Enzyme design. Structure first.
Site, PDB file in Angstrom:
ATOM      1  N   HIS A  74       0.811  -1.238   0.000  1.00 26.48           N
ATOM      2  CA  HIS A  74       0.000   0.000   0.000  1.00 26.48           C
ATOM      3  C   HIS A  74       0.826   1.260   0.000  1.00 26.48           C
ATOM      4  O   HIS A  74       0.810   2.033   0.933  1.00 26.48           O
ATOM      5  CB  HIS A  74      -0.998  -0.013   1.128  1.00 26.48           C
ATOM      6  N   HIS A  78       1.380   1.351  -5.769  1.00 26.27           N
ATOM      7  CA  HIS A  78       0.037   0.787  -5.856  1.00 26.27           C
ATOM      8  C   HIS A  78      -0.957   1.879  -6.195  1.00 26.27           C
ATOM      9  O   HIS A  78      -1.869   1.665  -6.956  1.00 26.27           O
ATOM     10  CB  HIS A  78      -0.342   0.114  -4.538  1.00 26.27           C
ATOM     11  N   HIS A 114      -6.783   7.058  -2.803  1.00 25.63           N
ATOM     12  CA  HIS A 114      -7.629   6.096  -2.090  1.00 25.63           C
ATOM     13  C   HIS A 114      -6.920   5.314  -0.992  1.00 25.63           C
ATOM     14  O   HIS A 114      -7.563   4.647  -0.216  1.00 25.63           O
ATOM     15  CB  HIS A 114      -8.324   5.142  -3.044  1.00 25.63           C
ATOM     16  N   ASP A 115      -5.599   5.341  -0.939  1.00 21.32           N
ATOM     17  CA  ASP A 115      -4.874   4.601   0.103  1.00 21.32           C
ATOM     18  C   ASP A 115      -3.814   5.447   0.805  1.00 21.32           C
ATOM     19  O   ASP A 115      -2.930   4.914   1.432  1.00 21.32           O
ATOM     20  CB  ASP A 115      -4.181   3.391  -0.531  1.00 21.32           C
ATOM     21  N   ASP A 232      -8.827  -1.246  -8.071  1.00 23.38           N
ATOM     22  CA  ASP A 232      -8.206  -1.681  -6.817  1.00 23.38           C
ATOM     23  C   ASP A 232      -7.922  -3.173  -6.790  1.00 23.38           C
ATOM     24  O   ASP A 232      -6.892  -3.601  -6.293  1.00 23.38           O
ATOM     25  CB  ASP A 232      -9.093  -1.334  -5.620  1.00 23.38           C
ATOM     26  N   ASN A 235      -4.951  -6.584  -9.960  1.00 29.78           N
ATOM     27  CA  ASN A 235      -3.677  -7.251 -10.043  1.00 29.78           C
ATOM     28  C   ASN A 235      -3.685  -8.570 -10.822  1.00 29.78           C
ATOM     29  O   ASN A 235      -2.763  -8.803 -11.599  1.00 29.78           O
ATOM     30  CB  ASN A 235      -3.017  -7.461  -8.625  1.00 29.78           C
ATOM     31  N   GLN A 283      -4.074 -17.334  -3.645  1.00 24.27           N
ATOM     32  CA  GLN A 283      -4.452 -16.572  -4.835  1.00 24.27           C
ATOM     33  C   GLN A 283      -5.553 -17.251  -5.642  1.00 24.27           C
ATOM     34  O   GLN A 283      -6.438 -16.570  -6.221  1.00 24.27           O
ATOM     35  CB  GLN A 283      -3.271 -16.312  -5.775  1.00 24.27           C
ATOM     36  N   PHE A 286      -8.625 -16.576  -4.030  1.00 24.00           N
ATOM     37  CA  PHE A 286      -8.884 -15.167  -4.161  1.00 24.00           C
ATOM     38  C   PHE A 286      -9.557 -14.874  -5.502  1.00 24.00           C
ATOM     39  O   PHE A 286     -10.550 -14.087  -5.592  1.00 24.00           O
ATOM     40  CB  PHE A 286      -7.583 -14.438  -3.969  1.00 24.00           C
TER      41      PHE A 286
HETATM   42  C1  LIG Z   1      -1.597  -9.910  -5.199  1.00 17.86           C
HETATM   43  C2  LIG Z   1      -2.940  -9.280  -5.328  1.00 17.86           C
HETATM   44  C3  LIG Z   1      -3.825  -9.348  -4.102  1.00 17.86           C
HETATM   45  N1  LIG Z   1      -4.469  -8.202  -3.740  1.00 17.86           N
HETATM   46  C4  LIG Z   1      -5.357  -8.153  -2.732  1.00 17.86           C
HETATM   47  N2  LIG Z   1      -5.833  -6.918  -2.436  1.00 17.86           N
HETATM   48  C5  LIG Z   1      -6.324  -6.640  -1.217  1.00 17.86           C
HETATM   49  C6  LIG Z   1      -7.091  -7.525  -0.466  1.00 17.86           C
HETATM   50  C7  LIG Z   1      -7.459  -7.232   0.853  1.00 17.86           C
HETATM   51  C8  LIG Z   1      -7.062  -6.071   1.472  1.00 17.86           C
HETATM   52  C9  LIG Z   1      -7.513  -5.774   2.902  1.00 17.86           C
HETATM   53  C10 LIG Z   1      -6.363  -5.839   3.938  1.00 17.86           C
HETATM   54  O1  LIG Z   1      -5.429  -4.713   3.830  1.00 17.86           O
HETATM   55  C11 LIG Z   1      -6.229  -5.210   0.748  1.00 17.86           C
HETATM   56  C12 LIG Z   1      -5.858  -5.515  -0.570  1.00 17.86           C
HETATM   57  N3  LIG Z   1      -5.526  -9.272  -1.986  1.00 17.86           N
HETATM   58  C13 LIG Z   1      -4.870 -10.434  -2.354  1.00 17.86           C
HETATM   59  C14 LIG Z   1      -5.096 -11.689  -1.575  1.00 17.86           C
HETATM   60  C15 LIG Z   1      -4.041 -12.401  -1.029  1.00 17.86           C
HETATM   61  C16 LIG Z   1      -4.280 -13.571  -0.300  1.00 17.86           C
HETATM   62  C17 LIG Z   1      -5.574 -14.018  -0.145  1.00 17.86           C
HETATM   63  C18 LIG Z   1      -6.625 -13.285  -0.680  1.00 17.86           C
HETATM   64 CL1  LIG Z   1      -8.326 -13.826  -0.482  1.00 17.86          CL
HETATM   65  C19 LIG Z   1      -6.389 -12.113  -1.400  1.00 17.86           C
HETATM   66  N4  LIG Z   1      -4.025 -10.503  -3.408  1.00 17.86           N
HETATM   67 MG   LIG Z   2      -7.615   0.846   0.299  1.00 19.66          MG
HETATM   68 ZN   LIG Z   3      -5.864   0.220  -2.837  1.00 19.76          ZN
END
Ligand SMILES: CCc1nc(Nc2ccc(CCO)cc2)nc(-c2cccc(Cl)c2)n1
Ligand SMILES: [Mg+2]
Ligand SMILES: [Zn+2]
Length: 339
Positions: A74, A78, A114-115, A232, A235, A283, A286
């Site tokens: 973050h 990003h 936003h972050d 957001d 990725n 992932q 996810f």
């Molecule tokens: C690499 C791209 C990626 N982006 C994201 N964004 C993302 C997800 C949650 C938060 C909230 C906490 O701050 C912030 C950013 N989340 C993952 C992710 C990783 C492990 C498991 C899961 Cl279900 C998702 N992967």
């Molecule tokens: Mg955010």
């Molecule tokens: Zn963000």
């Protein structure tokens, strides 16, 4: 030398897949500032809203300064990514000339901020550790309120008010929109944002040329929200070499959070234990439960402008699936993306 090399990279600014880390290196770590500058130029935003360019750069620099360098995911890079991804999505054919200049500005500005000032830990952690931010914002959309507050607060620095020549009415209108947009990036709002979007899709009216018809504010803002939320969460739809870098970064941020929980004797949040980690399976989870459902739905709404994004998404899933060595995920998804 290096400025000749940077300007070539920036020629890809309207392309999904921009080499945003290269630009990060080449710009002296000022990707947010260089990318926003480029996009404002490209879209004639300075002329339209009579934004002195020095004032723009001054604002961007301060904004970028307030992203934390030591946070792995973050950070300004990003933010730069999200700005650019939103910029591409705004030019999708199904959206040609749907949005006003002000709405466009709102989405790009929302994306940039936003972050901002992200500490690299989740809302939940801020709540559970009784932080000042959670106390200030009463446990509700804590980070996202703060991002907003910081982003607008910075307009008040010397020579930073990029909006000085908007009318009072344009300013108010723009401020409502940005707030609605950034609040929708609170991940806990995801299931609802997606459900509503699915519903909108079912009753959607296009033109002869496939272009979307948006009668009211309510529909337009909803589209802008989902747009920025897709950016957001963009990725895994990028070229794999970028996607993998982001994956390493997000997991490094989480593990660092997990390390803070450990040191303090707290239960280690899901996904945040480096010692019981499963990066690849995670992932895949996810994509299956969050990203693909989301992009599939965005793909219907702008059909067929995003077919290729889905294709790349699907390839990328295969890759991660193929590298899984032969509850956490589920608990992370329950805790992060539902209300
Ligand atoms: C690499 C791209 C990626 N982006 C994201 N964004 C993302 C997800 C949650 C938060 C909230 C906490 O701050 C912030 C950013 N989340 C993952 C992710 C990783 C492990 C498991 C899961 Cl279900 C998702 N992967
Ligand atoms: Mg955010
Ligand atoms: Zn963000």
């Amino acid at each position: 030398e290096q400025e000749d090399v940077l300007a070539k990279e920036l020629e890809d600014v309207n392309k999904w897949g921009l080499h945003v880390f290269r630009i990060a290196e080449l710009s002296g770590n000022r990707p947010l500032t260089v990318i926003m500058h480029t996009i404002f130029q490209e879209r004639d935003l300075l002329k339209t809203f009579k934004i002195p360019v020095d004032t723009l750069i001054t604002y961007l620099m301060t904004l970028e300064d307030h992203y934390h360098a030591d946070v792995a995911y973050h950070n300004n890079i990003h933010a730069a990514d999200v700005v650019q991804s939103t910029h591409v999505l705004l030019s999708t054919p199904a959206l040609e000339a749907v949005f006003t200049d002000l709405e466009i500005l709102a989405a790009i500005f929302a994306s940039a901020i936003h972050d901002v000032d992200h500490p690299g830990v989740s809302n939940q952690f801020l709540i559970n550790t009784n932080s000042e931010l959670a106390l200030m914002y009463n446990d509700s959309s804590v980070l996202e309120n703060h991002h907003l507050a910081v982003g607008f607060k910075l307009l008040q620095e010397e020579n930073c008010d990029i909006f000085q020549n908007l009318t009072k009415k344009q300013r108010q209108s723009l401020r409502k929109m940005v707030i609605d947009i950034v609040l929708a990036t609170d991940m806990s709002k995801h299931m609802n944002l997606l459900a509503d979007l699915k519903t909108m899709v079912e009753t959607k009216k296009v033109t002869s040329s496939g272009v979307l018809l948006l009668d009211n504010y309510s529909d337009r803002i909803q589209v802008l929200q989902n747009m920025v939320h897709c950016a957001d969460l963009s990725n895994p739809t990028k070229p794999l070499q970028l996607y993998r870098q982001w994956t390493d970064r997000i997991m490094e941020e989480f593990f660092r959070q997990g390390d803070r929980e450990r040191e303090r004797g707290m239960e280690i949040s899901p996904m945040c234990d480096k010692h019981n980690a499963s990066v690849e399976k995670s992932q895949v989870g996810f994509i299956d439960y969050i990203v693909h459902p989301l992009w599939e739905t965005w793909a219907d709404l702008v059909h067929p402008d995003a077919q290729d994004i889905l294709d790349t998404l699907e390839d990328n899933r295969e890759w991660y699936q193929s590298t899984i060595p032969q509850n956490q995920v589920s608990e992370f998804i329950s805790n992060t993306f539902l209300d």
